[PDB]
């Protein structure tokens, strides 16, 4: 009986948490008793009838006394398509934590179940320290809340990529990352972890939950036991409690590579044998190429390394069919040079620009850049995308170059996926649908390949959109900023061939204007009078 296995393994406290999440996500408090009811059945489960019945079927059959037409695993695919003083007073603590847990679980669908359990334990720790503390619980709580929202966005990515593309693509992704993370490990060890990681991910994307928490626990078990062959950065991670220990290995930094590593060229470009090796064990052979390239290059995005492996694969497929293969693929490393330099220059130019402008004007510059490229997107969407891209700048450009491409990749991949989700439910651009459609190694390059839209006809002048009101002085910095960034996008839609010099001079005018009248004694009068000098300034610059 699986329900028993996982009872015996997960525990009781963890089992109950796990049932709390999936059930909650599927149904949108009344049936919380049913989750405590399931535990009583589980004790019953461990030759009783209804016991050893399939886990999903028992959950699938039940909750649906929301289609419910076939109640099978082929239905699940259809289903997937469809106050400091008071907080301490609750501190039955177990009840208080459980309500807190439901609420996070209720809020987002694709949260990775295993991670959710971990944050709760940190939340308890802060309360236990805080009540003894004369008052800083709120900063610890804020810390944890901010981290969670991003995970739901990355997970959506992972699962869609697995549906979009086969496990071969997901395993390859994994091989690339773990080689970076665990360079001193040999290939057979890395391969072992990826198969395990894939199953745990494949299942939670499946939404079984159930085993992946047990499979995550076993995987975390395995590493700490076998540190000798994995990473010299695992020690501390591997002295913690289980949910902390596990979540911690997800976050562990890159280990140093072995010193005096050989060049990959012998055995991948210098050997007569490679077409034979490729024919004897193709995907293994290619897997090992990626292992060797990756472990030498923590300064590379995973996707980049996937392009290189792809390039190499394409080169063997043509070269090994040619007259003298050895000659034909002798130059292949010269092919990798431009693939590596395109992302590096792009990081170089955009950080140069961010450094010299600061977050806010950087955002303004991106706003100009992407409006011209895709003027048909709605103004609120252009503002949010550009705003988020700017923050990517501030998070990544701080790091030296060696750390930049993986950081960019990390955050930019979530932006581009959120963006593509929006575009699907209200398309406005064929170029964007295509960049969203294309293979993951090509998504970002395709977006990078967008040009200005020379067909776009200017928006007619409207006066309201470029007038500010005194109420703007009451707003937070974020909302005031958005106000002006809305004007800028609208300015570009009205003057789409104006230089970025003229466009920025006006945007600074918007800034100087709001700055000046928000200091004035009589604001209402400043906003009306100086409002004329702004109109004459933009007219001077742009007409």
């Amino acid at each position, epitope marked *: 009986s699986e329900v028993a296995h996982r009872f015996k393994d997960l525990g009781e406290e963890n089992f109950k948490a796990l049932v709390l999440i999936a059930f909650a996500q599927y149904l949108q408090e009344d049936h919380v008793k049913l989750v405590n009811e399931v535990t009583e059945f589980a004790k019953t489960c461990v030759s009783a009838e209804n016991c050893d019945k399939s886990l999903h079927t028992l959950f699938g059959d039940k909750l649906c006394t929301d289609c419910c037409a076939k109640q099978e695993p082929e239905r699940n695919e259809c289903f997937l398509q469809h106050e400091v003083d008071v907080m301490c007073t609750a501190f039955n603590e177990e009840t208080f934590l459980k309500k807190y847990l439901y609420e996070i679980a209720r809020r987002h669908p694709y949260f990775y179940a295993p991670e959710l359990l971990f944050f709760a334990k940190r939340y308890k720790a802060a309360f236990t320290e805080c009540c003894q503390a004369a008052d800083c619980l709120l900063p610890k709580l804020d810390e944890l809340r901010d981290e969670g929202k991003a995970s739901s966005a990355k997970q959506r990515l992972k699962c869609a990529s697995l549906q979009k593309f086969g496990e071969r693509a997901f395993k390859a992704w994994a091989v690339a990352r773990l080689s970076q993370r665990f360079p001193k490990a040999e290939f057979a060890e890395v391969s*072992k972890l990826v198969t395990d990681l894939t199953k745990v991910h494949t299942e939670c994307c499946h939404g079984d939950l159930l085993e992946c928490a047990d499979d995550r626990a076993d995987l975390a078990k395995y590493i700490c036991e*076998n540190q000798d062959s994995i990473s010299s950065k695992l020690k501390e991670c591997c002295e913690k409690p289980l949910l902390e220990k596990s979540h911690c290995i997800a976050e562990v930094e890159n280990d140093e590579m072995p010193a005096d590593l050989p060049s990959l060229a012998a055995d991948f470009v210098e050997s007569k044998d490679v077409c034979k090796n490729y024919a004897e064990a193709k995907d293994v052979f290619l897997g090992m190429f990626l292992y060797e390239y990756a472990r030498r290059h923590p300064d590379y995005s995973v996707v980049l390394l996937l392009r290189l492996a792809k390039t190499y694969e394409t080169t063997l497929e043509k070269c090994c069919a040619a007259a003298d293969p050895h000659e034909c693929y002798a130059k292949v490393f010269d092919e990798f040079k431009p693939l590596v330099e395109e992302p590096q220059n792009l990081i170089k130019q955009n950080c140069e620009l961010f450094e010299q402008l600061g977050e806010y004007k950087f955002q303004n510059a991106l706003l100009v850049r992407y409006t011209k490229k895709v003027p048909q997107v709605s103004t609120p969407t252009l503002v949010e995308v550009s705003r988020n891209l700017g923050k990517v700048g501030s998070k990544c450009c701080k790091h030296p170059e060696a750390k930049r491409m993986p950081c960019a990749e990390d955050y930019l991949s979530v932006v581009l996926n959120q963006l593509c989700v929006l575009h699907e439910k209200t398309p406005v651009s064929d170029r964007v649908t295509k960049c969203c459609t294309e293979s993951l190694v090509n998504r970002r390059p395709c977006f990078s390949a967008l040009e200005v839209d020379e067909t776009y006809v200017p928006k007619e002048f409207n006066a309201e959109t470029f007038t500010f009101h005194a109420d703007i002085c009451t707003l937070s910095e974020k909302e005031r900023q958005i106000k002006k960034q809305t004007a800028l996008v609208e300015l570009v839609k009205h003057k789409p061939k104006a230089t970025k010099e003229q466009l920025k001079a006006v945007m600074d005018d918007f800034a100087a204007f709001v700055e000046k009248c928000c200091k004035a004694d009589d604001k209402e009068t400043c906003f009306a009078e100086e409002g004329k000098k702004l109109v004459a300034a933009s007219q001077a610059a742009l007409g």
Partner: nanobody
Amino acid sequence: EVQLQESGGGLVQPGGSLRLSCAASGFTFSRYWMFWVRQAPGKGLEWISDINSGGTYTRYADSVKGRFTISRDNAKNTLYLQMNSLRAEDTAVYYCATNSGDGKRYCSGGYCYRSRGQGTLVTVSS
């Protein structure tokens, strides 16, 4: 410097059993994986069992699972393969292999090794 050397082969018969062994030289045994791969009369290499460096993980091709066991002794630099319930189809030259060293890779039968022993012949004739 890397040296693998199989032992323990000869003629045996249906139902019976046999143990194979391999000694290691060159680089240390404890830090790497080890592999047993076989070659039946009219075939190429079948990869049949794997072991991690610490001995904490093992893998078995379907055709030998349940009946075979792989294990090691890191002190003696010695890999073992314990074979039970032998059949006709287990006839083959058994080898052992590893990916230790910075030697050339050699792919065959759907995997790649850097070093292999000279391989010991086992015959399972009724």
